[PDB]
Amino acid sequence: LNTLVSELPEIYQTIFGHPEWDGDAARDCNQRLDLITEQYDNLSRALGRPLNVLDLGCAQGFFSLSLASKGATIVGIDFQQENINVCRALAEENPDFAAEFRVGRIEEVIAALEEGEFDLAIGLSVFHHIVHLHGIDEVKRLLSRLADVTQAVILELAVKEEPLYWGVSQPDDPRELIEQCAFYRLIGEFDTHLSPVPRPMYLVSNHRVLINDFNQPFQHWQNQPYAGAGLAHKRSRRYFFGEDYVCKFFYYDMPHGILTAEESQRNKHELHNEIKFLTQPPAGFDAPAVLAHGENAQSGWLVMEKLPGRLLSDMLAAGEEIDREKILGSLLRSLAALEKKGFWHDDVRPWNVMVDARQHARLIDFGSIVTTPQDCSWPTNLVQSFFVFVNELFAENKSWNGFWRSAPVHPFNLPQPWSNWLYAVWQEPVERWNFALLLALFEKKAKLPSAEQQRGATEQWIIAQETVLLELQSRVRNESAGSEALRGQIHTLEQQMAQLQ
Amino acid sequence: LNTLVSELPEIYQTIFGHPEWDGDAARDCNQRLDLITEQYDNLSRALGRPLNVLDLGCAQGFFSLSLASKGATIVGIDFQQENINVCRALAEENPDFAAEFRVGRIEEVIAALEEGEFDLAIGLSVFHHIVHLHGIDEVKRLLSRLADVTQAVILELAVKEEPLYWGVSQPDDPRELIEQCAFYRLIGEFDTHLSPVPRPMYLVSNHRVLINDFNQPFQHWQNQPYAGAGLAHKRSRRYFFGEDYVCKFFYYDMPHGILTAEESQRNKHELHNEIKFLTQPPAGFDAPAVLAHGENAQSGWLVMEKLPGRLLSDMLAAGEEIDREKILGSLLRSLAALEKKGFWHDDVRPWNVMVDARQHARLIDFGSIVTTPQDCSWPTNLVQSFFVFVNELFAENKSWNGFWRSAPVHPFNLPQPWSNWLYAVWQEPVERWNFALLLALFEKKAKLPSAEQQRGATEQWIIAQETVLLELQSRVRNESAGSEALRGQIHTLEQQMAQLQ
Amino acid sequence: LNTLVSELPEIYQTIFGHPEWDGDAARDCNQRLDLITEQYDNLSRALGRPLNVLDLGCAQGFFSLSLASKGATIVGIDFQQENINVCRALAEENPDFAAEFRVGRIEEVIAALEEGEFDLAIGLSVFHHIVHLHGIDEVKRLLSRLADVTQAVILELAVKEEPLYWGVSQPDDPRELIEQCAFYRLIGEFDTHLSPVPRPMYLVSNHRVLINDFNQPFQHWQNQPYAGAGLAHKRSRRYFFGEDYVCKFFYYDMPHGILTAEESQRNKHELHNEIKFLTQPPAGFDAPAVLAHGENAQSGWLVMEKLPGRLLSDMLAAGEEIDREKILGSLLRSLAALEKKGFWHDDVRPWNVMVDARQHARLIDFGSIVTTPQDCSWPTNLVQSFFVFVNELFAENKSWNGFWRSAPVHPFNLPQPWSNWLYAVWQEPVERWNFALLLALFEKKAKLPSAEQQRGATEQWIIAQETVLLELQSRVRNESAGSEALRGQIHTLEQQMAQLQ
Ligand SMILES: C[S@@+](CC[C@H](N)C(=O)[O-])C[C@H]1O[C@@H](n2cnc3c(N)ncnc32)[C@H](O)[C@@H]1O
Ligand SMILES: C[S@@+](CC[C@H](N)C(=O)[O-])C[C@H]1O[C@@H](n2cnc3c(N)ncnc32)[C@H](O)[C@@H]1O
Numbered sequence A, B, C: 001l002n003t004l005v006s007e008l009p010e011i012y013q014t015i016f017g018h019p020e021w022d023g024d025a026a027r028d029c030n031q032r033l034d035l036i037t038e039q040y041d042n043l044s045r046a047l048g049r050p051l052n053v054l055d056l057g058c059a060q061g062f063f064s065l066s067l068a069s070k071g072a073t074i075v076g077i078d079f080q081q082e083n084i085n086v087c088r089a090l091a092e093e094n095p096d097f098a099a100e101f102r103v104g105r106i107e108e109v110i111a112a113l114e115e116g117e118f119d120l121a122i123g124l125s126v127f128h129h130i131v132h133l134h135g136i137d138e139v140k141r142l143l144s145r146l147a148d149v150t151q152a153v154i155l156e157l158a159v160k161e162e163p164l165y166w167g168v169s170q171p172d173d174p175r176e177l178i179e180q181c182a183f184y185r186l187i188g189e190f191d192t193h194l195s196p197v198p199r200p201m202y203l204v205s206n207h208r209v210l211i212n213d214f215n216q217p218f219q220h221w222q223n224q225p226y227a228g229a230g231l232a233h234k235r236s237r238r239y240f241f242g243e244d245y246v247c248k249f250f251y252y253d254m255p256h257g258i259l260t261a262e263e264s265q266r267n268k269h270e271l272h273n274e275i276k277f278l279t280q281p282p283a284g285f286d287a288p289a290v291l292a293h294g295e296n297a298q299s300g301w302l303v304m305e306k307l308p309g310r311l312l313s314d315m316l317a318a319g320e321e322i323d324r325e326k327i328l329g330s331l332l333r334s335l336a337a338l339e340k341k342g343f344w345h346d347d348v349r350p351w352n353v354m355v356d357a358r359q360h361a362r363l364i365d366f367g368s369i370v371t372t373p374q375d376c377s378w379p380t381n382l383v384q385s386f387f388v389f390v391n392e393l394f395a396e397n398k399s400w401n402g403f404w405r406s407a408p409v410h411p412f413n414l415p416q417p418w419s420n421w422l423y424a425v426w427q428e429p430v431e432r433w434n435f436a437l438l439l440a441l442f443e444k445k446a447k448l449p450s451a452e453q454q455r456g457a458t459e460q461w462i463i464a465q466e467t468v469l470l471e472l473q474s475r476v477r478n479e480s481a482g483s484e485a486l487r488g489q490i491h492t493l494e495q496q497m498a499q500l501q
């Protein structure tokens, strides 16, 4: 037994149960255990039972046994023989610890898994040898399917910047081996004696949100804020669904090359604005409660209430008849309340609304709640953006896309009587353009003058021009798109020449 | 004789004179005759003499003889021998019928023709064998030159959707074999016992309009409404000239694939509007009389007076000095009369006008006479379109093409005193913008204020912007055109790869 | 001696000293001398000493000796032998004439030169044989480096349109062999007995301005009026620096193919306007004096004072903080004075200004001093152009390039209080829009109303639209540029096919 232990070749781990060889070969080992433990406990409590564990690359089966010691089933895998023998023997020493173990190569043992066979897999300082053998492209799929078959995988990756030969083969950033998955958070990081460049400790999943505290599953997930949002935020923002919750996860740091100052800073700013607003807000609304908020080294995480109903942008996208009025009424009521307080929401656009059987329209993305000044992103000085939004709301007119979306400002196309409402607001001087005014005008809009008549001169002229402008922008988009497509195809051909040479 | 008749191989036709073999082999034969007869009679009366006839593919010379029986010269052609022998004999039975006949292959007998040798050619159930032998591309030229050498050709084409082997070679639409010619109308159609898919009966010409009643020659013809109109109407609209008449011919149905609902419907709507207007119109104009109107299954035909003078668009296109004023005066006078009645013409554009030695401008295309509402196609609410038109009229400024033509709205560039006229109209509220007002202002425009002075602010600003806008549209057109050209060239290259593979 | 002279083969020149062979072989020779002399004298006086001379291709050393006779050092070069022998002997006849001479081929004798070894080189009827041997591409460099190593080169070129065989090899325009250099002026031209097509006489330099009278060196030189001016003037306009002077040189005639009527005429018009203005101008400014003005057959030359300080466009281009106000004050003061006189400057744009420690802004390019009417090139009726210019002045906003530069018209973005100044001007009717008004408003602008408040309606709307417009133009520029680049690359490929065939 003792003899078989030394027969062992390179004691990477601590042998579990006796401390006599802790002095000889090793790495720290015991700390990593502590964090994994924390994670296990939190996870298990959250679903409501003990868990199945996969110690992919276990060596001396240290981690397995230490987990099995707390009511866990482990099937530890280390392809080389001696490491397994001794750890299976270590398994027998403490009979109550349900751990199986076997010799075999991880790649194929992963292949042979089930959608929910295991709840947890461990990949501590193991894959860097695999990727050296196979390649980045290969390994990525293993891990991706590993997240799919389990429910949460924790890994410790060796970075390319290490002395050992294999280093050169692995990716400059170990984060490249995980990105393909849904959730990933930096739960830890450890320094190596090899070089002053430490190896990180990541946490993944393809079914659940795995925060410090909030460990709940999601239904669907993505990478963009809304339908037709694009690349606007450099693939950095992540959005997770949930039956009763919704999650935001912005990264402050990205693989390879980077979110420039402004982007990183702004999504940092955005979150910190949101959390500081949602906790301690004004009076007179039905705003969602903070379900979970928190920050990490490179990553900033937020979770809130999955408030009811669904988005307008997608409604208009289809055409589900929405009562034009009701949404506006509620929005204005709250909006007024806000204008009163001294706050403001700059992005008054149709991608920020909710609808139910009462159509009580409430906003989303409270990171746009700008306190001090009106401004928006485009139509300067709010009220105009609101006009656009109103045109965007009514709509039923072609499909205009000007980068700086979309519909005409001004009511004249708007049917009667809103037509009139807005012309009345319009007449007035800009200094009086506060939302308090609008709502009031909004309310007694039925008694307002004919609008469409008092126009003539200018005001007709510009209607004709506003329609011309969107068509122009609208086309520029398409020919610009043709141009961008060729820019993309031209890169390929430049590369191709080198391949052909 | 009788013996030679049966010696004959396959009695496709009825032998002419005796009814004894009408029972044996056949196709109906006698009906087709009746329609051809009608057509001959109408044609002959219209020019004022009997006619030369070409029975291309005659078989038993039935049709020839039946035509020769009414004072016609026929040179019937059937390449195979037996069919000719018997029909020449049938020719001799009735000596007074001037018909020659000979054995030879149609293709070469067509080649040997003269510009006005024949007045009529018959191609009843014959070419489908030719196109099987040669091909669609080939046959098209035969027919095209056949229309050129004669004066009217009637054909009966076998459609590709027929059981017989040759079917597969012919075009899915038999209308593809004729389109290259000037005039074509569906004069009939016949069902075949082969399959429940009938073979049509078309009527062509490259010199004359061949209506039911109106059978008059034209000088020149085309496919587009005006110089620089484009593909806007899917090659469906045809326009025929004439020394004293003008013709319109819109198709409700096209070869291969199709005028979508809107296009078919709109050109149907356009005609039906025109005929319903020109007959029973308002008071106070010099409008043209209906020379001929009528409808067919797939085709809608209209003919009216070739009213005098010539178009303005082409005048401006060159530069023939037109008295700026006179045209406007008359146009307004009638226009006013119309506004008064309750009617309206929406397309107040320079492609719709006439000019003589008195410049009494009158419109064209009475399918744009929209009764109820002002609107136009672009510059909304007429009066503005009129402004554009006035700028379009004066002009002498570069060459602006914005899709939504072209010139600035507003008079400020317009020289004095119209400058003033329009600023005065402009000042006024839009609700008062009726043509009745304009004419009156038009008349006393000499006594109007300085216009160009009272501007300042806005009104200058927008002048500068209006000039910018056309330049922008104007360029977008060209780079858009470059883009469309590459889209066209790219298709070719995609195809090319398949050819090269 | 006399015997050696006839031993000579072809007496192209006159033998210097005796007139006995002037009758036999020759070309005129003596006239060319007279012009070269003039040039030498003027040059020498201007630097303040006698000069070193290179008689590249000298034949009978006539010109050399004639120059050496006036205190010049000559190293005459004629590759063929006999011509040198006799001219070295002619050199010895008049011992006081410092001339060396040697046999060798010009190309290599040029190679062996120094930056300031010689002050003058002569290339009279010599290179056409070289270019026949080598080629246009080759010869151009010889001459280019010849201008660099000397300080002024005069040449007489044989044009391609000559009977002699070599003609076919030389360029259709002999001006093609010089253009690469900095300065070139047509100082003369001579008819040849060969054909009624004369050979010209050009004067070059790469260090100095070589006018009739003004023979001063420059520091730097170019081809475009300012940073980012482009090809706008067909490579015809040349601009020469100087420690105390500045030079303009516009060509009325260009190599190959040509400055069309308008371009030639306009740069002729531009100069003649300038000289007629700068001499006999209005009162109330600090305008520069004419240092030298004059005209030539194909070339129009002007030189004026290098007035102090530097350009604004390049200041803004970098960002050297300029006192927003001071420049405006002075400009307006003079501008007012001008408006008063009855004159005007149409191109009120930031590429036409100067700055010092007092920022007393004064204009440049007095060829834009249009007397009678306001107009500019774009923003019609001056005052608006001034608005643009003011926006262009303040700036600090992105980088807008609309062809018709650039910034918004109108003050509303302009900070306070100019904001107000311009709204006040704006309010007023256009007929009152003279600069006299503006300055006065400019002065008491501190006491003006709030501007930014009284807006509302329209005036806000158009602010939003003005920003949209520049972005649109701004993009059109880039995609237009992509398009133009492909137009350029496509030409190459069309050519390539012919090369590949
Ligand atoms: C360095 S250890 C770390 C073990 C454990 N994850 C830890 O951190 O305590 C990695 C172990 O996995 C094994 N291993 C490496 N590549 C493997 C593969 N493709 N399949 C199975 N085991 C592998 C090695 O034998 C080695 O003992
Ligand atoms: C089916 S028939 C119809 C005859 C006649 N057009 C009618 O409908 O009563 C066609 C006849 O034209 C002849 N034919 C076919 N191809 C021909 C060609 N290329 N040249 C001359 N005759 C041809 C055939 O022999 C056949 O008898």
Ligand SMILES: C[S@@+](CC[C@H](N)C(=O)[O-])C[C@H]1O[C@@H](n2cnc3c(N)ncnc32)[C@H](O)[C@@H]1O
Residues within 6 Å of the ligand: C012, C013, C056, C057, C058, C059, C063, C077, C078, C079, C080, C083, C104, C105, C106, C107, C122, C123, C124, C125, C126, C129, C130
């Ligand atoms: C026609 S002459 C003119 C001489 C002198 N430039 C003049 O105009 O009085 C040109 C002379 O230069 C010589 N020459 C031609 N090509 C030359 C070369 N590549 N190098 C040196 N000398 C050359 C010829 O021998 C000839 O005598």
